[PDB]
Each structure stands twice: as C-alpha cells, then as structure tokens.
Amino acid sequence: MLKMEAVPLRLEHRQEVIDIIVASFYNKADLEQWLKPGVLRTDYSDILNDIWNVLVERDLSFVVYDTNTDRIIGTALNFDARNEPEVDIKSKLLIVFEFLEFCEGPIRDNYLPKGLNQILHSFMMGTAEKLNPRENIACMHFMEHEVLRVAREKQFAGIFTTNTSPLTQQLADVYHYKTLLNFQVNEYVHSDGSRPFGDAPDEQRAIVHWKEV
Ligand SMILES: [Ca+2]
Numbered sequence: 001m002l003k004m005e006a007v008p009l010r011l012e013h014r015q016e017v018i019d020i021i022v023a024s025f026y027n028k029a030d031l032e033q034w035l036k037p038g039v040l041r042t043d044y045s046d047i048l049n050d051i052w053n054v055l056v057e058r059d060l061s062f063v064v065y066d067t068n069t070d071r072i073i074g075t076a077l078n079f080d081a082r083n084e085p086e087v088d089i090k091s092k093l094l095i096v097f098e099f100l101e102f103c104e105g106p107i108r109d110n111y112l113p114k115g116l117n118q119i120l121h122s123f124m125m126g127t128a129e130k131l132n133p134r135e136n137i138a139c140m141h142f143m144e145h146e147v148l149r150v151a152r153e154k155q156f157a158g159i160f161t162t163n164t165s166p167l168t169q170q171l172a173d174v175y176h177y178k179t180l181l182n183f184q185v186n187e188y189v190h191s192d193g194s195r196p197f198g199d200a201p202d203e204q205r206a207i208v209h210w211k212e213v
Contacts, residue, residue, distance in 0.1 A: 002138045003068055006146040009061040009075075014052050016072045017063065018045045024126030030164050030204060031099065031185065034197040035092045043091035054085045060120065060150060064139055074127040074139040076147055081108055081119035081160050095196050099188050103162050103208050107180050112210065113157045120151045120213075122161040125168070140167075144175055151213040158212040169207045177209035 009017070025032070026041045048055075055061055055077060064074035079085075089097060112119055127139045151159050159177075163169040164185075173179075183206045185197040197204070 002066065002135050004073070004139065004142045005065045005067050006062045006142070006149075007065055008059060009056045009063060009077075011053070011056050013056075013063055013072070013075075014049070017075050017077075018048050020072065020075050020126045020128055021045075021048060021077075021124060023129040029096075030200075031096050031197060031206075032093070034185075034200050035095060038092050040091065043089075043093045046091075047087060047089060047093070050087050051085050055079075058083075060154065062146060062150070064143060064146075072128070073131060073135070074143055075125070076122065076143045077124040078147065078150065079121045079123055080116060080156075081112075081121035082116055084121065084123075092196075095190060098190075099185070099197075099206070100162050102188060103181055103183055103206050104160070107208055107210075108160065111180070112160065117155060118157045119160045120147070120154070120156040120158065122147055122159055140171060144171060148175075148211075148213065156213055158210055161209050163207045163209055164205075169205065169209075172207070172209040172211075175211065177211040179207055180210050181206075181208035183207075 022041045022044050025044055032039050058079060060078040062076055063072045066073045125143055127136050131139060147159060163172050184202060185204050185206050186195060186200040188195060188197060190196050
C-alpha cells in the first residue's frame with residue numbers, strides 16, 4: 001500500500017515541483033491541447049519560477065512524499081483567491097488563464113465570501129509521471145483530503161477551483177464540491193473573436209467547484 005505524507009512547500013522543492021507540474025500538464029492538459037502548436041514546457045516552468053518565492057512564503061501549498069522511498073510524488077499549489085501574485089504570461093497559456101478568469105471571476109467576486117483568508121484557491125495539482133493508476137488515484141485522494149485539512153486549519157471558509165479534466169471533475173463531485181458553473185469549453189470566445197478551444201468536443205467541460213469548509 002502506498003504510504004504518503006504531506007509536507008509544507010520549501011524553497012528547495014522548486015525543481016521537483018516544476019518537474020511534476022511540467023510532466024502533469026504539458027501535452028496532457030485538456031485545454032492546452034487545443035492551442036497547439038506553440039505551447040512549450042518552459043511556459044509552465046516560467047510561470048512557476050516567477051511565483052516560486054511567494055508560493056512558498058504564503059504557506060498554503062504542500063508536496064506529497066512516498067514515505068517508503070522518501071521522494072516527492074505529488075504537489076498541491078494553493079493561494080488565497082483574493083491575494084494571488086500578479087504574473088504576466090508571454091505564451092498562449094495566457095488564453096488559458098483568461099478563460100479560467102472568465103469562469104471564476106463573476107462567481108468569485110459576486111457570490112463567494114468577501115475579504116482575505118476566505119477563499120482557498122486550489123490552482124494547481126499534479127502527480128509524478130511514473131505513478132501507475134492505483135498510485136495516481138491514491139495520491140489524488142490524499143491531496144484532496146489534505147487540501148481540506150489546510151483550509152480548516154488555516155481558517156478559510158471554503159475551497160475554490162476550476163476542474164478541466166474528467167477525473168478532477170468527478171473527484172470533486174464525490175468529495176461533495178458544489179458545481180457553480182458547467183461551461184462548454186468550445187463556446188469560449190477570445191478577444192480576437194476566435195474560439196481557441198473550438199475544436200474540442202461538446203462534452204469537454206470546465207467546471208467551477210466550491211466546497212464550504
Ligand atoms: Ca494503495
């Protein structure tokens with residue numbers, strides 16, 4: 001059985017965290033696959049390097065160790081939704097972040113609690129590339145359980161996230177997250193009038209999820 005431990009993010013975790021996020025997203029991500037070509041691995045690592053110090057100092061994120069091997073197998077990166085660093089993105093990834101703000105913004109600022117230390121934003125979750133299905137599912141359940149623990153212990157009101165893959169969407173449902181928006185990603189229109197995910201099937205959703213703590 002996979003034995004795991006959640007450890008607060010440290011400064012020296014940067015390369016291990018970058019490796020997990022790059023592997024977990026690049027090519028794999030359900031939105032960026034429709035922005036091909038022009039998405040590079042460094043687009044993800046550039047964003048993470050730009051926020052790394054603030055990410056560690058806010059003390060809301062963690063890594064997951066396989067206690068048997070003492071190696072990092074997953075990571076959960078979190079911010080206060082109302083206290084997130086201002087990063088400017090060069091790549092086509094900016095379209096992804098603008099779409100997520102399209103989904104999250106109106107709901108966050110008009111229906112969720114006001115003030116700092118209220119909304120815990122689960123903004124990245126990833127697992128190591130070499131995990132088999134059993135280990136991936138176990139790690140996801142573990143991080144989902146620990147994000148809840150951080151939320152209560154840090155006195156947040158709830159957890160807020162947009163889930164863009166079928167597995168993360170279904171996990172959120174069985175963990176009793178409330179669905180606040182179920183958006184068809186091929187209907188999103190960019191500022192230039194194009195639909196950057198327009199080639200996606202009608203069944204690909206972006207789901208805004210909220211769980212009171
Ligand atoms: Ca297991």
